Each structure stands twice: as C-alpha cells, then as structure tokens.
Design an enzyme around this catalytic site. Structure first.
Site, PDB file in Angstrom:
ATOM      1  N   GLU A 355       0.820  -1.208   0.000  1.00  0.00           N
ATOM      2  CA  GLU A 355       0.000   0.000   0.000  1.00  0.00           C
ATOM      3  C   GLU A 355       0.856   1.261   0.000  1.00  0.00           C
ATOM      4  O   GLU A 355       0.509   2.249  -0.656  1.00  0.00           O
ATOM      5  CB  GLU A 355      -0.972  -0.018   1.180  1.00  0.00           C
ATOM      6  CG  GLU A 355      -1.882  -1.236   1.201  1.00  0.00           C
ATOM      7  CD  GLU A 355      -2.810  -1.300   0.000  1.00  0.00           C
ATOM      8  OE1 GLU A 355      -3.132  -0.235  -0.569  1.00  0.00           O
ATOM      9  OE2 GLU A 355      -3.211  -2.418  -0.383  1.00  0.00           O
ATOM     10  N   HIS A 485     -15.263  -8.958  -8.225  1.00  0.00           N
ATOM     11  CA  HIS A 485     -14.937  -8.109  -9.366  1.00  0.00           C
ATOM     12  C   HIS A 485     -15.978  -8.208 -10.473  1.00  0.00           C
ATOM     13  O   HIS A 485     -16.149  -7.256 -11.244  1.00  0.00           O
ATOM     14  CB  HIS A 485     -13.548  -8.453  -9.903  1.00  0.00           C
ATOM     15  CG  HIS A 485     -12.449  -8.255  -8.907  1.00  0.00           C
ATOM     16  ND1 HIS A 485     -12.268  -9.084  -7.821  1.00  0.00           N
ATOM     17  CD2 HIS A 485     -11.474  -7.317  -8.832  1.00  0.00           C
ATOM     18  CE1 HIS A 485     -11.227  -8.667  -7.121  1.00  0.00           C
ATOM     19  NE2 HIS A 485     -10.728  -7.597  -7.712  1.00  0.00           N
TER      20      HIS A 485
END
Ligand SMILES: *[C@@H]1O[C@H](CO)[C@@H](O[C@@H]2O[C@H](CO)[C@@H](O[C@@H]3O[C@H](CO)[C@@H](O)[C@H](O)[C@@H]3O)[C@H](O)[C@H]2NC(C)=O)[C@H](O)[C@H]1NC(C)=O
Ligand code: NAG
Ligand code: CL
Ligand code: NA
Ligand code: ZN
Lengths: 594, 188
Positions: A355, A485
């Site tokens: 991240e 998704h």
C-alpha cells in the site's frame, strides 16, 4: 485551436482538483466512519464531481482531437472526451445504477444458513471464506461453495442479464464493440510511432504469453492434485480436474490456503514471523516506520506528516464502523493516506509495503497535470505495490529487519517451500484470471448466448483452469457473478498484466541493484540506481504511453513472460521431477457426479 | 525612529498574489536582527545583497511587497521564473536587489471548510512587467468569439481561488510572502 485548448485545460485542472478533493475527503469519512450522514456526504460530493466532469466532457468534445499538435495536450482532451454512462436515457442510467448497486449489495449482504443448524448463518466474509480456506470436510466445503452460488448467485442472475445489455449499450455508443472492448481500451496507445498498441492487440498478447504459462501451471496442477488426493481420498481422480471447492477459497482464485496440504518439505521451519513481531512488541506504527525506511534506502522521499496523522493505519479503536479492506488513498492536494486495519501479523507487514508502494507512485507523478496523475495502465499501480512485497518477503530482508533469527539457514528446500507458496498465489491465479476475463469478453462480444452462459463457463473452467464443478449447475445459477470483481463492475485482466509487469520490474531493478543470486532472493534495498531507474517511470504518470514507461525500466515495449518464468525456474524443474510418476494435465470429461 | 516592519510581517490580513500591496519605507533606521534570528520563516532568500552585510548599509527607500501563495508557488517569487504566479501575478526584475521571505500559515490561512479567499490570476494577455500589478476582473477571451460580458465557452474568469484545506500537503498549504525591495534615508 491549440492555445484555445491549453487555457481550457487549465480552467479544468484548477477547478477539478478542488472538486475531486472534496469528493475524496467525503468518501474517506465514509470508509473511516460508516454512518448514514457520512454515506450521503459521499454521494452528495460524488454527483457534484460527476456533474462537473460531464460539463467538461461535452465541452471538451467540441475540441477536435486532430487539431492538436503538441501531444502532451492531446492525451488530456481524450481523457475528458467521454460520454460515460450519460449516453443512456435518464431511465436507463438510473436502472443501470440501480442494478450495479443492487448487485454490490447482495454480494456484501448475502448470507447462507446451515441446513443442519439453521441458527448458524454465515455471510461470505468472514463466514464462508474461513470455511473455504481452512476446512477439510468435502461436504462442508461443498456446502459453502454451492450455497454461495445457489443463493446469492441465482439472485444476481436476472440482474446480471440486464447488466450485460445495458453496459454494451454504453460502449457501442462510444465507438466500441462491447463493454469488454471498453475495458481493453485502457491499454490502447495510438499516435506515437514505435510505441502504439491497439485494443485488439491485448487479446493477442495475453493469449501468447498464457501459452508459456501452461507448462508451469500444468505441473503445479498435477502436483497439487496428487497432494489433494491424500487430503480428500476417494473424491479426486488422478487424471481429472480439481473440484472447485477444494482450491483454497470460494472461487479458486488463489491456492495459498493449500500450502498446508501441498507443502513440499513440511519438516522445515516455516518463515512466518507473525509470532516474532508479537514477541518483539510491534504495532502498526512500527510496521509502517520500517516500510518507510525501505523506500528511503533507495532514494525515494519519506511520508508526509499528514500521512502519519490523517491515515487510518489501525483498527477503529473507538466508536465507529469501518471497512477494513486495505486501500491506498490519493486524495490529491498532497494528501496521501492509507486505510488499513493493521494487525500484528506477517501478512499485514508485507501489505504495508504494497500500500505504501501505491503512495510512492502517487507522490512521484504529483507534478504532472491533473488528468495525467495516474498509473501508466490499470496494471502498473498494482505492479508497483507488488514489487515492494517481493523484496520485503525475502529472507535476506526479514533477517536484516529483525523478524527472522540471524542463524536461520536458507537451505535449498526452504527456497522450494517459499517458491511453492509463491506459486500457489502468483502462478495459481493466472489461468483463473485469464479464463474469467475471457468468458466476459465472449459474453460482451456476443459469442456466448444466454441459454449456455454457465454451460460455456464450466467448459472453459475444465479446459483452461483445469477445475471441475462438484455439483451440476444449469443456467439458473450465476457462479461468475459470485466473485466480487464480476458483480461490482471491475475489469479483471489487470491482474494478469500486473503479474507479468511486477516480474519485469523486479528483474529490471535487481539488475540495477546488481543482484547476483536467484531472482526470488533479491532485495532492491540500498539501490539508488534501481530507485532512480524506477522513479524515472513513476514520475511519468499517464503522460507517456505505458509501452514507453515500461521501456524506461525494463527496456521492452511490451509485456514479457520470461521474467515470470525465471522467478519460478528453480521450482519448475522441481515440479517436473516430482511429477515423473504422476500425470501432468487433466481430462475435461471427469466430474465428481457422472 | 524604527522602521515599522511589524506592520507588514505581523499583519493580521494578507492580500492575494494578484492584488499584492506595496509599502514604502522612508526616513527610519532599520533592524534586520528581527528578521534573521527567527525560525518562523520558510525561505528568506536574498538577491543582489547578502543576508548579513545589509545591517551596515543604507538605501534611498525600501519597498515591502506582501501576498499569499501556495507552497509550490513560492519558487516563482524569484528573478527569472516563468510560472503562473510569476507571469500573471507578481514578477521580479532580472536585476532585482532585495530579499524574499515566506513562511507557512496553515493554522491561520487554511480553514476546515476550505479557505477560498486567497486567489490568483490564471489567464492574462501577455506577461507582467517587473513590479507590475493587475487587478482587472475582465472576462479573459481565449478564442475569437467576443465574450460580451458573460463567461462560457472560451470565456473564463481570470481569477481562481486557491482553496486551502488543512489536510493538504505542504506544497498546497498557504504561505505568506514578504518581498523586500531595495532602491538607491534607510540605514541600519
Ligand atoms: C541500506 O538499507 C539497509 C536496510 O534494508 C540498511 O541495513 C541496516 O541498517 C541499519 C542502520 O545502519 C542497521 O542498524 C544497526 O544495526 C546494528 C547491528 O545490529 C545495531 O547495533 C544498531 O543499533 C543499528 O540497529 C542494521 O543492522 C542494518 N541491517 C542489517 C545489517 O541487517 C543499511 O544500513 C542501508 N544503508 C547502507 C549504507 O548500507
Ligand atoms: C461519525 O459520523 C457522525 C455523524 O454521522 C459524527 O457525529 C461522528 O463524530 C463521526 N465519528 C467519527 C469518529 O468521525
Ligand atoms: Cl466459479
Ligand atoms: Na486448508
Ligand atoms: Zn494495491
């Protein structure tokens, strides 16, 4: 009309940066609170940013793209010139946004109950996901796999049917073949000689590189199948495909949870530093402080003070509801944050490097104009975060940080154990990712009729992925929509391209880092050359084509599979030796219910 | 008498860069000790003169320019810059002789709801001459169509707001700038 366009783009950059910041800060207060008052501020600030983008969309379409000479100004106009979802009528756009929100809801709110114990009802996270990842009972896993696809899958079936026709009506109106062609347009480069890339070229390149992945996956499939027969005897054929509910998660996307069942040498000590940091008194701030030190060693800048003060680096340690999905926020205006409910574990230590890798990408292209502050393509951003976790997971880096004992011997069997765990996650998801996006591409293109959606879905699962369904599904089910998704309107080919990108980046940086051993033992720490070589592409943002940005680091104008095979080369030769008395491959006809 | 440097540096309200104000300094003795022994300033960069030898120096009169820009715009308050602030808001001559002082004011010039008071000129016909000042709010005509009073297509308002939020990065935080110009009464 070029100077008339430069002043137009400047009225946008200095007006959009403020509206996007208000919408991003509003959406931060929702993922950091989770109230009804804060969910409205996200939607109120969201429509204002969308309505501003719509005015600048049509008013930029009045600028003929052919009339622009300076090409940096050219790509900015095409970014604004997007009708988007507004090409539909006011009723079509509301119904499209209604099903898109309804699908995301039933996925997150869908819960199945146990017929044996009706008081026991579990949703996907953490209920069903914990079963598919840890349970060894065939029927219990079959229950979680089928109940998720028979309850919440069938509800998404009528909504997904209208989702395909409505999304195609948007792309076909914007000069695209279908919605799948719209997603493939992210890799399109058209204008620069020697660096162009067509939307149809993506299909040719993804399939060409996938053929070289077949040998590594087939041997991994044969090795995992042999180990899975010992875990589920009298359930798996030594020549047939793997049952879908025995792959480690709800969909078989990652085989990481199969490591306990497929470990090559289980007697060797596992490199799990989770208990080590707990004993060394580590908090989330310690994890990110060490991750910050990693990026500084290569020449990249530190984290802003606002990052160490406004980010949510830990669990909501007070009264507030929070989504704990690790996300890296780039709100603009120099405000970079990370939302993550970090726990004192090894998996959160590596994720912190991923991240923060996104943030280093965002900090680099901050000098670029607003419409150019983004990754080269959809796969570049995730690839940047992954190369950090690749270097941060090496035993050389863990020993230098203090998480592994200094007298930890790195045998040739500990490295095969490590590569096998990496292959279950990295190479195990490649056939799943390609087959999934290939199925949606055909559905959008119109090659799979509605009366054989699930029939063709599992024909590809058997042939491409080598996975057979445990119980038969008609066209009433909708197993592909049972994945996040698919039901949340996200392209999936980005995970295939990012996988090849991260190893092209790693090989390119380890050469600049002057690494000499195996590629998986490489740590790009201390390498100002590799940091400068990587920063030369991170600063580009979306200004230069992704083919050029990729060439600035790896020296190639297109994705290449050789770096991926070199990473797992010591493991590929080990699987061939293990499968000398096994069957490599699978028959597309066997099923656990014939 | 001492020169009133506190009336410009410690001033409560600071102007926008497009409408920067100038204050002339005439018969009074200067005290540059106040300016140097403070960690309050972010830049304090002198041009044409040194930050120490100025104490034993005399000038005909001193001019103090004050305004507010973002962090990244402080680099343009220097001789030989070509940014938006330098070209359309405040330009320094190539032979500039003085010092440029700036300091961060996030706590006083940035509010939670967004401080849109501080503005700057984004569009203008040609660049500004050194020390020129333009406060016109006329609709900038970027095309060949007459704006005729109303903005719209190819007709944008010349002034835009900075929009200082307290959660911004240092490059987007408000900075108060004071430019001291030396012209050849004022001594040390
Ligand atoms: C390049 O980056 C690496 C980290 O990826 C740096 O290696 C580590 O650097 C720190 C700071 O010098 C060393 O910390 C010191 O270690 C000694 C011995 O344990 C201890 O007595 C000190 O109190 C301090 O903790 C750290 O040991 C070292 N890691 C190792 C050797 O495993 C490296 O310094 C960076 N720069 C250079 C110039 O190499
Ligand atoms: C969450 O939102 C409510 C309003 O909906 C607000 O009163 C509260 O202070 C917020 N909490 C945090 C921690 O932001
Ligand atoms: Cl599936
Ligand atoms: Na398991
Ligand atoms: Zn990520």
């Amino acid at each position: 009309t070029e100077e008339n366009a430069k002043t137009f783009l400047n009225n946008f950059n200095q007006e959009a940066e403020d509206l996007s910041y208000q919408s991003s800060l509003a959406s931060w207060n929702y993922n950091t609170n989770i109230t009804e008052e804060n969910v409205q501020n996200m939607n109120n600030a969201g429509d204002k940013w969308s309505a501003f983008l719509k005015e600048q969309s049509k008013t930029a379409q009045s600028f003929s793209l052919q009339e622009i000479q300076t090409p940096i100004i050219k790509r900015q106009l095409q970014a604004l010139q997007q009708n988007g979802s507004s090409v539909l009528s006011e009723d079509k756009s509301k119904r499209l946004n209604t099903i898109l929100n309804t699908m995301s809801t039933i996925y997150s709110t869908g819960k199945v109950c146990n017929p044996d114990n009706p008081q026991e009802c579990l949703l996907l996270e953490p209920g069903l996901n914990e079963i598919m990842a840890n349970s060894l009972d065939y029927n219990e896993r079959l229950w979680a796999w089928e109940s998720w696809r028979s309850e919440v899958g069938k509800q998404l079936r009528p909504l997904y049917e209208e989702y395909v026709v409505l999304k195609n009506e948007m792309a076909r109106a914007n000069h695209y073949e279908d919605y799948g062609d719209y997603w493939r347009g992210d890799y399109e480069v058209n204008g620069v000689d020697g660096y162009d890339y067509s939307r149809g070229q993506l299909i040719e390149d993804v399939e060409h590189t996938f053929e070289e992945i077949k040998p590594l996956y087939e041997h991994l499939h044969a090795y995992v199948r042999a180990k899975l027969m010992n875990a589920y005897p009298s359930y798996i054929s030594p020549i047939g495909c793997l049952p879908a509910h025995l792959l480690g998660d709800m969909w078989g996307r990652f085989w990481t949870n199969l490591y306990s069942l497929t470990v090559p040498f289980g007697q060797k000590p596992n490199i799990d530093v989770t208990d080590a940091m707990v004993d060394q008194a580590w908090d989330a701030q310690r994890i990110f402080k060490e991750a910050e030190k990693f990026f500084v060693s290569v020449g990249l800048p530190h984290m802003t003070q606002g990052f160490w003060a406004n980010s949510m680096l830990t669990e909501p340690a007070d009264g507030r509801k929070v989504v704990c999905h690790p996300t890296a926020w780039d709100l603009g205006h120099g405000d970079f944050r990370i939302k993550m409910c970090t726990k004192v574990t090894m998996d959160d230590f590596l994720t912190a490097h991923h991240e923060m890798g996104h943030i280093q990408y965002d900090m680099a292209y901050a000098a670029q104009p607003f419409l150019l502050r983004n990754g080269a393509n959809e796969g570049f951003h995730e690839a940047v975060g992954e190369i950090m976790s690749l270097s941060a997971a090496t035993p050389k880096h863990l020993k230098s940080i203090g998480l592994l004992s200094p007298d930890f011997q790195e045998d040739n069997e500990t490295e095969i154990n490590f590569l096998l765990k990496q292959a279950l996650t990295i190479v195990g998801t490649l056939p799943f990712t390609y087959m999934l996006e290939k199925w949606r591409w055909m559905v959008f293109k119109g090659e799979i009729p509605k009366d054989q959606w699930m029939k063709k879905w599992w024909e590809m699962k058997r042939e491409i992925v080598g996975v057979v369904e445990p119980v038969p599904h008609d066209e009433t089910y909708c197993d592909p929509a049972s994945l996040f998704h698919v039901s949340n309107d996200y392209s999936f080919i980005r995970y295939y391209t990012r996988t090849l990108y991260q190893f092209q980046f790693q090989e390119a940086l380890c050469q600049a880092a002057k690494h000499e051993g195996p590629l998986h033992k490489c740590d790009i720490s201390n390498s100002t050359e590799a940091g400068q070589k990587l920063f030369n592409m991170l600063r580009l943002g979306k200004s230069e084509p992704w083919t050029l940005a990729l060439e600035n680091v790896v020296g190639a104008k297109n994705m290449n599979v050789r770096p991926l095979l070199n990473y797992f080369e010591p493991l590929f030769t080990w699987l061939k030796d293990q499968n000398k008395n096994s069957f490599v491959g699978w028959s597309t006809d066997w099923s656990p219910y014939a | 008498n001492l020169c009133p440097f506190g009336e410009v540096f410690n001033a409560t309200k600071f102007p926008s860069v497009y409408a920067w104000e100038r204050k002339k300094i005439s018969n009074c003795v200067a005290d540059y000790s106040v300016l140097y022994n403070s960690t309050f300033f972010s830049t304090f960069k002198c041009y044409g003169v040194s930050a120490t030898k100025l104490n034993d120096l005399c000038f005909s009169n001193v001019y103090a320019d004050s305004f507010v820009v973002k962090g990244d715009d402080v680099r343009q308050i220097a001789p030989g810059q070509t940014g938006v602030i330098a070209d359309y808001n405040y330009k320094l001559p190539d032979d500039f002789m003085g010092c440029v002082l700036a300091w961060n004011t996030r706590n006083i010039d940035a509010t939670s709801t967004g401080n849109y008071n501080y503005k700057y000129r984004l569009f203008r016909k040609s660049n500004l001459k050194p020390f020129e000042r333009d406060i016109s709010t006329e609709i900038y005509q970027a095309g060949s169509t007459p704006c005729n009073g109303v903005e719209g297509f190819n007709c944008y308002f010349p002034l835009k707001s900075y929009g200082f939020h307290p959660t911004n990065g240092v490059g987007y935080q408000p900075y108060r700038v004071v430019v001291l110009s030396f012209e050849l009464t004022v001594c040390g």
